[PDB]
Design an enzyme around this catalytic site. Structure first.
Site, mmCIF file in Angstrom:
data_model
loop_
_atom_site.group_PDB
_atom_site.id
_atom_site.type_symbol
_atom_site.label_atom_id
_atom_site.label_comp_id
_atom_site.label_asym_id
_atom_site.label_seq_id
_atom_site.Cartn_x
_atom_site.Cartn_y
_atom_site.Cartn_z
ATOM 1 N N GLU A 116 0.771 -1.261 0.000
ATOM 2 C CA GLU A 116 0.000 0.000 0.000
ATOM 3 C C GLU A 116 0.802 1.312 0.000
ATOM 4 O O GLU A 116 0.490 2.230 0.774
ATOM 5 C CB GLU A 116 -1.054 -0.014 1.117
ATOM 6 C CG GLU A 116 -2.081 -1.125 0.948
ATOM 7 C CD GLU A 116 -2.981 -1.303 2.158
ATOM 8 O OE1 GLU A 116 -2.936 -0.473 3.091
ATOM 9 O OE2 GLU A 116 -3.755 -2.277 2.175
ATOM 10 N N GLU A 232 -5.499 -9.993 -2.845
ATOM 11 C CA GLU A 232 -6.445 -9.946 -1.725
ATOM 12 C C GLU A 232 -7.888 -9.808 -2.220
ATOM 13 O O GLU A 232 -8.613 -8.881 -1.846
ATOM 14 C CB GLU A 232 -6.051 -8.824 -0.753
ATOM 15 C CG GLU A 232 -4.585 -8.889 -0.341
ATOM 16 C CD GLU A 232 -4.168 -7.845 0.668
ATOM 17 O OE1 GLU A 232 -5.044 -7.188 1.267
ATOM 18 O OE2 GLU A 232 -2.946 -7.693 0.862
HETATM 19 O O1 LIG Z 1 -7.525 -8.959 10.069
HETATM 20 C C1 LIG Z 1 -7.438 -7.895 9.112
HETATM 21 C C2 LIG Z 1 -6.798 -8.414 7.833
HETATM 22 O O2 LIG Z 1 -7.680 -9.361 7.213
HETATM 23 C C3 LIG Z 1 -6.503 -7.262 6.870
HETATM 24 O O3 LIG Z 1 -5.815 -7.768 5.731
HETATM 25 O O4 LIG Z 1 -5.691 -6.265 7.503
HETATM 26 C C4 LIG Z 1 -6.340 -5.669 8.631
HETATM 27 C C5 LIG Z 1 -6.625 -6.737 9.689
HETATM 28 O O5 LIG Z 1 -7.352 -6.147 10.768
#
Ligand SMILES: O[C@@H]1[C@@H](O)[C@H](O)OC[C@H]1O
Ligand SMILES: [Ca+2]
Length: 303
Positions: A116, A232
């Site tokens: 990020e 993700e």
């Molecule tokens: O558990 C969460 C996770 O899934 C995310 O990727 O990053 C923030 C965390 O709070």
């Protein structure tokens, strides 16, 4: 057998306590959801809690699937103690963190060095903000010195490991892609980057932006010559029908792109990040949602 068992690219998932049950029956690659974050490992200074990261790594090894280390440098879930240290001491801590990970985990398939850069640099002094941007040279002359220094560290400590940059809300706009491409290019100039990651969470893939825009932006990133990974991926499920329709619209755009070498879902069971938005593909009672039924059939037909 995992959904992508006979596919030319992997379909993995974020690994964690809630995602554990039946993991290897569905997914053939992993990323530790939280355990590889610096603040998870070194919440208390100079005592390393490797337990959760060890689990993800060993599970990957035992199930013979690629392991993506997540993540070396990021702007949240960093150790609370580091934010008040002088840049000089912060840098030594960063160096040690890189060395510690490199030493313990020789079989990292993809090392996520920076997550990020456009959204959450480690410049905040809140609980897990890290506040170590200046320890990495700040913005510097290029605007992205701290990213460069992070990857230089990575090449030094992980001299034979594929290095990756990761971010979100990139392919959803030409402007963001152009911004991200600049970072990738600066890294490429020093031959520091091996792979480009884009998250593609639910908020990045709403019907407000045409699929052609995502596709054109994937093409733009692909022109670097570097493999792309979707890191993700998730899609909300306020209804089963919406999640299904969104999977049909969105997933094939990424799965079928020749520059995309793999996709990782950001969880599949309740307790995943977007739990309140019901992004899970399996219900609380253990039943598979229509989106997952489709996904299995779609992946099988698209190897
Ligand atoms: O558990 C969460 C996770 O899934 C995310 O990727 O990053 C923030 C965390 O709070
Ligand atoms: Ca330390």
């Amino acid at each position: 057998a995992p959904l992508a068992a006979t596919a030319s690219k992997f379909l993995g998932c974020a690994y964690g306590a809630q995602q554990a049950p039946g993991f290897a029956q569905y997914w053939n690659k992993l990323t530790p959801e939280n355990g590889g974050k610096w603040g998870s490992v070194e919440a208390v200074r100079d005592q390393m809690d490797w337990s959760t990261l060890d689990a993800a790594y060993r599970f990957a090894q035992a199930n013979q699937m690629p392991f993506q280390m997540h993540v070396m440098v990021w702007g949240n879930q960093q150790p609370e103690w580091i934010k008040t240290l002088r840049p000089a001491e912060q840098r030594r801590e960063i160096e040690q963190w890189f060395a510690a990970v490199a030493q313990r985990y020789p079989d990292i398939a993809l090392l996520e060095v920076v997550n990020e850069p456009l959204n959450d640099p480690p410049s905040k002094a809140d609980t897990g903000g890290g506040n170590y941007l200046q320890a990495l040279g700040g913005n510097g002359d290029s605007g992205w010195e701290w990213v460069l220094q992070s990857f230089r560290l990575a090449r030094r400590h992980f001299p034979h490991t594929k290095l990756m940059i990761n971010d979100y809300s990139i392919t959803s706009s030409a402007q963001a892609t152009q911004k991200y491409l600049q970072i990738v290019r600066l890294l490429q100039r020093e031959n520091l980057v091996d792979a480009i990651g884009v998250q593609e969470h639910a908020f990045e893939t709403t019907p407000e932006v045409a699929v052609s825009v995502h596709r054109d932006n994937l093409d733009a990133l692909a022109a670097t010559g570097l493999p792309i990974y979707i890191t993700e991926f998730d899609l909300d499920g306020p209804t089963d029908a919406q999640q299904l329709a969104d999977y049909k619209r969105v997933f094939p755009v990424f799965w079928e792109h020749p520059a995309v070498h793999g996709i990782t879902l950001w969880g599949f069971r309740p307790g995943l990040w977007r739990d309140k938005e019901a992004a899970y593909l399996i219900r609380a009672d253990g039943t598979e949602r229509p989106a997952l039924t489709w996904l299995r059939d779609y992946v099988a037909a698209h190897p």
